[PDB]
Ligand binder design. Structure first.
Ligand SMILES: [Gd+3]
Ligand SMILES: [Gd+3]
Ligand SMILES: [Gd+3]
Ligand SMILES: [Gd+3]
Ligand SMILES: [Gd+3]
Ligand SMILES: [Gd+3]
Lengths: 219, 222
């Protein structure tokens, strides 16, 4: 069948998740001071408990960010090491889309507004809406900008959206006067488990990369 | 097929990104620069070297990695990649000092036996080390590794004696660090660590059983 191993260290969360035909085996935690110090243990626990072998995985999915500059790269490096080891293609998954896919998993959100607390007053933003087939649209809306522009962009949308990401909690004032119906997507950080559905789909479409060109996204 | 010590080393602790394999008496290495942590080039370098030597990751005896000190991000990316490469093949890992690595490079290039290693740690400091190669080719001075201010480096050099060679970006970040040290200093011809130089150190550590499991690969904390 089809097997995909997902890894994410892009934000304050570090997570691993194995998709095995339909069986999802995942772990999720907040990364300690030594950011990725738990990733390998998580990978070892998941592979052993699922009785799966790296030799039998079909592709490595990795969190491409945006998020922490340091965090993201370490996770990617780990994924590359594993992927070169098993001669496997890699799949870069947006942390914003991942959180969007997260909202739809907990409740049923279809129109997500991803906001991650970035650098300065800046913020990683994205407008994601999944179609009927369950595919997320709006990857082009991804960008890094100030809460003022966030306020502007928002007043050019419609209907009701659910919110995800640290951005909203950092500025609960971000929604104020957004001129839109807003709820709580119940997703603060992205999880590898949610990379799986996206990865699966990208693997089916050929949206993969050679280990040598796996890298963070540049907003 | 033909058995023999096989050790794969990679490093991204500094701006440099290098890889090297010790395969049956010979050294096969690549050295490049990876500015702004764009370390993806480590993977093709590893692949090419493996392919050229007819070596498989499963044939490796140990994977040597950069333990630092160096860039906060760089050292961790390197460890991450090394960990990824070691899991499937269950490769033992060997942490090699970035500072010691440069000392080894100085010996390689000019037979230096007493090395003053200094890395621009940024934010006003430097990673320091005093390494002396004994007759058996063993590097002493690891216990001297520390993070300190230039003025403190100056004070410490005055407590030193003899002739030394300098290596690392530390010296260029602080040009007067050598002046009035009371020591006779020559350039060691090493600005940044190179995987090639991790190999000798790694062979010796593997011989002494100084290794760790994948999940225990860690950066040094100074
Ligand atoms: Gd502590
Ligand atoms: Gd560029
Ligand atoms: Gd900077
Ligand atoms: Gd600090
Ligand atoms: Gd000679
Ligand atoms: Gd000079």
């Amino acid at each position: 069948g089809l097997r995909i191993l997902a890894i994410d260290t892009a934000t304050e969360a570090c997570s691993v998740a194995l998709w095995n035909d339909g069986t999802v085996n995942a772990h999720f935690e907040l990364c300690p001071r030594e950011h990725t110090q738990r990733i390998l243990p998580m990978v070892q626990d998941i592979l052993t408990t699922s009785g799966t072998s790296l030799t039998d995985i079909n592709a490595l999915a990795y969190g491409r960010g945006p998020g922490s500059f340091t965090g993201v790269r370490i996770g990617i490096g780990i994924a590359q090491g594993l992927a070169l080891g098993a001669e496997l293609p890699m799949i870069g998954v947006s942390t914003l889309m991942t959180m969007a896919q997260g909202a739809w998993r907990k409740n049923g959100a279809t129109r997500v507004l991803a906001a991650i607390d970035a650098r300065m007053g800046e913020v990683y933003w994205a407008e994601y809406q999944r179609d009927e087939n369950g595919i997320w649209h709006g990857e082009e809306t991804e960008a890094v900008l100030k809460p003022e522009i966030v306020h502007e962009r928002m007043q050019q949308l419609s209907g009701e959206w659910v919110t995800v990401g640290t951005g909203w909690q950092a500025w609960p004032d971000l929604g104020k006067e957004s001129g839109l119906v807003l709820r709580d997507g119940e997703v603060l950080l992205p999880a590898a488990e949610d990379m799986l559905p996206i990865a699966c789909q990208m693997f089916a479409e050929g949206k993969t990369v050679a280990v040598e060109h796996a890298e963070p996204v540049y907003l």
